Amino acid sequence: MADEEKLPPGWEKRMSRSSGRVYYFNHITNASQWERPSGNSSSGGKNGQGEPARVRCSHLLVKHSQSRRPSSWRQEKITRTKEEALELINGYIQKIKSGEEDFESLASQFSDCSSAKARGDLGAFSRGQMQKPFEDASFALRTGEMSGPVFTDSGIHIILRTE
């Protein structure tokens, strides 16, 4: 029996609810991923021109009922519960990683924010014009990394860096 199919303490080999898909859930820091933590044989990383002094990513923003603004260009009566927003946004990621819909094509489609026209792309910007806590934040993710539902003031939204 292979013991290497196990995970180090803190990591729990979990499964998707009613789906049967197996992934890795770290209950220590609450992190989650599908790639083996020690799978350093092949790391994902795209080539981006320019150092982390400026970056360019794409995001999918979903607004909920109790948001700063309950209205948008596509829906002015946005009344969706937080559980709904989470399940729909996580559902999008799942089809993306499955190669069903690309983040770009999908973001331009399901973006609740005004970034829909730009396919979720925020553009390439340099440090200075960011909020103090977010300024150093912009430069943390590299080209090829996609995070899940991040909880900021604006609401629930995912992110993917392209440059």
Binding site: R14, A31, Q33, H59, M130, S154, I159
Partner: peptide, 23 residues
């Protein structure tokens, strides 16, 4: 349970509030 890959440590980027956009 969440399912999609989400890194607790490295998840920071232009997450909307990187500018005056929205908030």
């Amino acid at each position: 349970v969440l399912t999609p890959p989400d890194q607790e440590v490295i998840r920071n980027i232009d997450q909307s509030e990187f500018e005056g956009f929205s908030f």
